[PDB]
Design a protein around this ligand. Structure first.
Ligand code: XV5
Ligand code: CA
Length: 835
């Protein structure tokens, strides 16, 4: 190695052994240190080196002479030697320069009695060279982190990182490696493999088995961790469906059927109600054909709410999409069971939050911010602007008409509404510490939903005066149709929502809005629940609070409104109009919800959008931008246990907790900066080795038990796409690719060695729990392991347990800024060093 170009015989490597080199899989890197036969204690005395006397390889060796010059110029400037060397410069001059630097390095080592300062200096120097930084990884692509590398299936130099799999972009749309001819709403292959960080190979049968193992662990967390059967997760969210092999959907579906019997009846299904985050318009019909074993979002209704109500006044659509642009056309929804089950929302922890922070940062701080890779300080200043925009009548960045969106989400038939934490409480600050201006209106709607919201739905779109309004009516419990005359409970249930999306709305003196309440509501007293005022929304918490504002239906069951009742407003809460009316005389404890039956299911689907699923409410119970806890009583899971009576009062039946995995701290993405739980190194570390952002493993256990004590189900966020920040390095044969895994031609990284962080400790929760339940699962549920998965043609393979993650179980990684030449070669032979 160390050539006849220095003080050899002194600076040569101690022995031909591997305990003398800092190596990665027996290869050397530009940041590799080594143990020389002799060190030079200060610039003074050559002494025999100990086992603790490692020194930078770059102190005494260089890949080319060009690099030695670069090293001398750099290390002179660092150590206070204003001598520069230029284009012309013999080997003898630079070897003399290299000695001198060597001598002063050793002097500073003895002065400070550490090498920490030199680790940094060598690192900083290495990152100045194109072959050891981003410049050899360019050009960047639309990957969230600027690009990715794909690990080669057959690398002769790295056979330990080989795979017979790494089958990419097997989305629901593209599961067979061809576009599914059945699903035509999305032209595209319906997603892409490389999203973030280390991309897990969910096409590998051994990894599939391990994803099921993790699923079983989460669904038995209570039993396994705390020997407590009251502290298990009831259900899952499947994170990033469009970025993983869709085989995982048959695996998770089969498990819910085999383990929880969700296929038998609605009681079983509704005790384990599991959701997808699946953005392709193909994913809902895919999931329906697969057996409604889980439910997807209604993306169409989300876009209809966003563009009809939430957008600025000049970017706002007409209101008719609120009726027609959804999985369910709500003109006249009179069905006992909707065709397809779904959940509905206007915002989520990611959707229409991090997007708005990015808009603010890009507009008023850093125009060159990459994807969602924000700094904490960018976030804090963005939130100064955001929090002011929330309280403004004229909003530049934040949603208009939040209460109008929730009035529709919480009265609509044939979808499970999901309330976002950050619409009731502030997106920043401590958990449940600060209420939004919309908290009252949303709370009032949640309590009214339990008491009044049942039966058939009618929505109408009336052109009035200069613009338009919509009416949305529920007929009341037992009344699917406008002609049903109902019983006593029908009479005191039902609701009328009236909305406009234009602040200039003025009815003519001649205009009337006739709202059919249904044949159970003839000649009846009605009172307001919400009314738009000049400064916001007045909530009425009882019949008596509203005593002065009572109005009546006529003999046909119609409420009638005029200009006196309806006009456009502009205030911090309403841009248009909102009016919500309920019948007078509901008992204090009236509850028109319905439980799931044990009657056998007969249509081949697990989940059914009937009155019992319509009775459920989902709560997404975190924000990305929650402040870190300063003391135990501010930990979210401790606050959840303390406030569990609130959630029951609101009719929350399904509590979607944040992912509970201990966050990585690399800061390479938003998730790793605000530590939400989506960026992790250990899949089984649920606040066990260290608190998560939300508290300790014991705080989580107590939160689950508290929710269960009120009959509320708890959802585990299943995140099989990627992992962050592995502590051990590994050398892989890699190819630069776009997020679809297509090779970027004109790249130095092409069947080339590259140094990834892709090995786990072997001493973490993964090492304890990995594969630990595969024998139990194959014994109880052999059919799970008999199924030939669609993408691979073969069953899951539980014959190997994953105690340590390594490169062979991953597709690739986001580019790490280590360059195409980071692994060192002998210049003459043009081959890599191997020990
Ligand atoms: O491509 C889409 C996307 C990205 C998306 C993907 C993710 O896995 C994620 O964690 C967050 C995202 O927002 O958001 C959309 C919304 C509507 C239609 C298409 C897209
Ligand atoms: Ca992936």
């Amino acid at each position: 190695t160390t050539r006849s170009n220095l003080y050899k015989k002194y600076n040569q490597v101690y022995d031909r052994s591997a305990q003398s080199f800092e190596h990665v899989d027996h290869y050397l890197t530009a940041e590799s240190w080594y143990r020389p036969k002799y060190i030079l204690k200060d610039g003074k005395t050559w002494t025999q080196s100990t086992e603790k006397d490692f020194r930078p390889l770059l102190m005494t060796w260089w890949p080319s002479q060009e690099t030695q010059r670069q090293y001398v110029n750099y290390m002179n400037a660092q150590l206070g030697i204003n001598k520069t060397y230029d284009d012309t410069s013999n080997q003898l001059q630079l070897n003399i320069a290299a000695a001198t630097i060597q001598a002063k390095i050793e002097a500073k080592i003895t002065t400070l009695k550490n090498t920490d300062w030199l680790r940094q200096t060598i690192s900083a120097f290495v990152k100045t060279q194109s072959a050891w930084n981003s410049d050899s990884e360019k050009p960047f692509d639309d990957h969230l982190q600027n690009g990715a590398v794909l690990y080669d299936n057959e690398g002769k130099l790295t056979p330990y990182a080989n795979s017979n799999y790494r089958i990419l972009n097997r989305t629901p749309t593209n599961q067979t490696g061809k576009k599914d001819p059945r699903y035509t709403a999305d032209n595209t292959i319906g997603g892409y493999e490389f999203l973030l960080a280390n991309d897990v190979d969910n096409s590998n049968p051994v990894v599939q088995a391990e994803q099921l193992n993790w699923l079983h662990f989460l669904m038995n967390f209570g039993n396994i961790y705390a020997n407590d059967p009251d502290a298990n997760f009831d259900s899952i969210r499947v994170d990033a469906v469009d970025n993983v092999d869709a085989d995982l959907l048959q695996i998770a579906g089969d498990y819910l059927k085999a383990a929880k019997g969700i296929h038998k009846n609605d009681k079983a299904a509704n005790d384990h109600l599991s959701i997808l985050e699946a953005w392709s318009d193909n994913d809902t019909p895919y999931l329906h054909d697969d057996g409604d074993n889980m439910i997807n979002m209604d993306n169409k209704l989300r876009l209809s709410l966003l563009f009809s109500l939430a957008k600025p006044l000049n970017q706002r659509s007409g209101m008719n999409p609120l009726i027609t642009n959804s999985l369910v056309n709500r003109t006249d929804d009179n069905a006992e069971t909707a065709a397809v089950p779904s959940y509905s929302f206007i915002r989520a922890h990611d959707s229409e939050v991090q997007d708005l922070i990015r808009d603010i940062i890009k507009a008023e701080i850093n125009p060159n911010v990459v994807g969602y890779s924000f700094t904490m300080e960018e976030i804090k200043k963005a939130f100064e602007i955001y929090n002011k925009d929330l309280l403004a009548t004229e909003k530049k960045y934040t949603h208009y008409n939040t209460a109008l969106s929730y009035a529709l989400l919480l009265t609509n038939k044939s979808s499970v509404p999901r309330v976002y934490y950050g619409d009731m409480f502030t997106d920043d600050g401590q958990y449940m510490a600060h209420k939004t201006i919309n908290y009252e209106a949303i709370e009032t709607l949640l309590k009214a939903r339990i008491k009044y919201v049942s039966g058939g739905q009618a929505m109408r779109n009336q052109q009035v005066g200069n613009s338009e309004i919509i009416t949305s009516v529920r007929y009341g419990k037992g009344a699917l149709k406008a002609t049903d005359t109902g019983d006593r409970t029908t009479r005191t249930s039902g609701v009328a929502v009236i909305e406009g999306n234009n602040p200039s709305l003025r009815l003519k003196a001649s205009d009337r809005v006739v709202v059919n309440m249904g044949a159970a509501h003839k000649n009846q007293a009605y009172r307001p629940l919400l009314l738009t005022t000049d400064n916001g929304i007045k909530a009425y918490h009882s019949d008596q609070e509203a005593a002065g504002l009572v109005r009546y239906t006529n003999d046909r069951g119609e409420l009638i409104f005029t200009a006196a009742d309806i006009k456009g407003y502009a205030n911090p809460q309403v841009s248009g109009y909102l009016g919500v009316w309920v019948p007078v005389g509901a008992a204090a404890d009236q509850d028109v919800r319905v439980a799931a039956s044990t009657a056998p299911s007969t249509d081949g689907k697990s989940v059914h959008q009937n009155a019992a699923l319509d009775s459920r409410v989902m709560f997404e119970g975190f924000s990305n931008f929650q402040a870190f806890a300063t003391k135990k009583e501010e930990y979210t899971n401790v606050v959840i246990a303390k406030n569990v009576d609130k959630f029951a009062e609101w009719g929350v039946t399904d509590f979607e907790m944040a992912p509970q995995y201990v966050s990585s701290t690399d800061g390479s993405f938003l998730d790793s900066v605000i530590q939400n739980g989506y960026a992790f190194t250990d899949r089984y570390d649920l606040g066990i080795s260290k608190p998560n952002k939300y508290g300790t493993a014991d705080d989580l256990v107590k939160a689950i038990k508290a929710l269960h004590s009120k009959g509320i189900k708890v959802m585990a966020d299943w995140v099989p796409d990627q992992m962050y920040a592995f502590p051990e390095k590994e050398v892989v044969t890699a190819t630069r690719v776009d997020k679809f895994g297509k090779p970027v031609e004109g790249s130095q990284i092409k069947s080339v060695l590259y140094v990834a962080d892709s090995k786990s400790s072997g001493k973490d929760q993964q090492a304890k729990y990995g594969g630990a339940f595969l024998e139990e699962l194959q014994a109880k549920y052999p059919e799970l392991f008999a199924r030939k998965q669609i993408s691979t043609g073969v069953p899951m393979d539980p014959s190997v347990k994953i105690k340590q993650w390594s490169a062979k179980y991953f597709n690739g990684t986001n580019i790490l800024g280590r360059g195409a030449g980071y692994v060192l070669k002998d210049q003459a032979t043009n081959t890599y060093f191997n020990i």
